[model samples]
Target: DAPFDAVLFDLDGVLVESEGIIAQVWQSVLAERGLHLDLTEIAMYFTGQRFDGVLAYLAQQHDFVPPPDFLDVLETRFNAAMTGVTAIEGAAETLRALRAAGVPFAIGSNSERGRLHLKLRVAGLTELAGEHIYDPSWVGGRGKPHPDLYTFAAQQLGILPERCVVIEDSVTGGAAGLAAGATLWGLLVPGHPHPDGAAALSRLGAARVLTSHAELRAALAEAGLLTPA
Candidate 1:
């Protein structure tokens, strides 16, 4: 009996393939500040984390200081880079099925505000976003391994934490959903090294991992989110 009225999404790898662009800008930003970091290390540590968390991590480990007042500039650059991002396969169709089933959903991301909106808009996911979409900055907290943002989203939807189902694609995001007492599904993309994303997600409290949007549809059907005949 998984309680779920809405599916809260994680931005980067979940909705679109914009992570490469995000990494590009971040790498450039770090280089501009005369700092070098292993991209793989950053991805492993910072995936599903809030922007400030990544910044603080860099500050503590690499002694890099992003301009105190330059967050707006950084956000702008990130948004600009997302202007032409490609939506992940099946993301649109999956969202469409949820909408057709009268499921209420929203986007919850660790991305900064502008990039979050920009990516959604470019990928044509704005309909799923609407006023319900949010980033960590909006809630004054971080995600992944922390339940604040997910809890915050559930509160906004007027649902208890247990009534939420978070569909995410990162290890950290799945953990956050578990911490919040919500059901999580790890969706494995077509070309990722970790095909066992769902199993890994389960390690962090996900009830299951779905290999494709079609499987998600079947799960929803079994759960009574769609017409049964």
Candidate 2:
């Protein structure tokens, strides 16, 4: 018997290795304004959040106002950087295994539709994910830290939130999954630059903190969510 009916995954840091590149872009953009932020700070404060929301928070906290062309520049830089982005180790294989086992899964991401699709395409998970990708737009602009995205995804997957397992890499996403009544499994891959990421996830209500997809796969198999291959 499976412990969960479906799995909900967070896109950026969970599935793809794009978070580091994204932090670099944010650092460069902030550096241009004389507001320098390190990767750890970026990960803690802004990762897994909407760009506009991050900018608003920055403006309120640091008095940083972006130029009118900020979005264009950010998008261009992100797109260029993400062209080389790769999937997390075993991510594609694990998803394929889950599919082979008839396990329903969906991606609930804070990323915008275009960027989300771009990441999926670049990571070569577009076909595997198919129509089960949910961005903030799918939930009326409400993103992580709000349960709407995961809740909507669970609904779309034909599973109750309580019957789904949410795998996330950030505190914001973990909180959302917890709020959605799903069992939250936090991920902080080995060598991730985010300081104390594991502790942060644990503090945010993750029932388990996974260090790699290999570990995640083993755990899922042990739980009967995925069959041994």
Candidate 3:
């Protein structure tokens, strides 16, 4: 039985379409710093990664250091561009269902707490998971692909890693969940860049790569985290 005790969600593509807005800012940031990567490459390389990690990758590969205020400015610009940002389809419904089921859940994201909260608030998800969110900026240590974020989220929820399910929309995030010893359902959510996100996630060892929250509901039910439809 694939029973799970709790659900941990990724914020960007899993819960909201904030990545689209942030991508605009990221692309501009890169160009301003003379990195000049195509938008597709930016999404492929940096999606679901920590801000510092993304900068480090750029620096290592391109030998460029972004201004110290790059992240801060990026957040400001993204937030300003969030005029139309909204929660992903079925995300709020799923969160509400989990709440009604009395299941423990939280948001574990690579984005910082301020930006995470900003996106959630704008997308109207604050009441669902604002308080139970974890970002490495607040929790310390490395972010995705290292397991610290997922493990910390599971620990904060008082659940064993094996009993937690992390719903992620990126390969790095899925890997983090698996490394944390938790079940990971990789999501090929809409409105993101990659046309082959599911395959990429499967290559990273996602136990299951689902295409949408409609499918996710069924998976959650099968995993004993939600009521059967």
Candidate 4:
């Protein structure tokens, strides 16, 4: 198949360095509630999931109700951590390159609007994403790891799924990209759950595992998705 026309990105991990940052925050909150999860479990099951859905899953699995204001606490800490949050290296530049090459792009995340907006704003991506961010709130049930979100996002971008490349950084997002019939490129970030995170993503149907946006741009150009300089 030829290189893609529209690119869809998963926000938390692919565009911003918030996966572990917020995962650690959630782990702290869960520890306070007597439910503890190591980073691996968190990475495998929690990365790329919506906060309320995650809390609901945990409550169901543990047979306990979460505190009424648990999400509030989580959001508070997550928002306050913006000072420490940063965009994924080269992410904004990558978007700029895509636009310069005339490739349409958008952000589709499993994140709730309240937190997703903050993360995008914090990472200086709100304007780049503009009104193109898609979420479960707009799609109704069925988040990442499910094709529905990506499928719908493709339609919103006015591109066929096969002509879209979904840039993801987690298994859930990878699976969703594949399920949506999009080419999946998983970003292998430092401090990812395991040293073999890239391999794990490839196993889950990532066409390639890129180390950073610089590589991503190069790869896209080599694949003829972008015009060469």
TM-score of each: 0.71, 0.80, 0.77, 0.76
Residue lDDT tens for model 2, 112-222: 899899889988989887689999998899998899999999999899999999998877788899999999998878645432478888887888999888888888888
Q: Which is the leading candidate under TM-score?
A: 2
Name the runs in model 1 displaced over 4 angstroms: 21-80, 192-196
| Model 1 accuracy (lDDT, Cα) | 0.73
* Candidate 4 lDDT: 0.79
Cα displacement (angstroms), candidate 1, residue 88, comes to 1.1
| Residues forming the 10-long window of minimal summed lDDT in candidate 3 | 188-197
**Model 2 poorest ten-residue lDDT run:** 188-197
Which whole-number lDDT from 0 to 100 does residue 21 have in model 3?
61
Q: Rate the local accuracy (lDDT) of all candidates.
A: 0.73, 0.84, 0.81, 0.79
Write candidate 4's Cα lDDT for 44-67 as tens digits: 667657877786778777775668
lDDT of 1 by residue, 124-157 (tens): 8788555777788867767555888888888888
Please estimate how well model 2 matches the true structure, expressed as its whole-model Cα lDDT: 0.84
Per-candidate RMSD, Å:
5.3, 3.8, 4.6, 4.6
Residue-pair clashes, model 2: 0
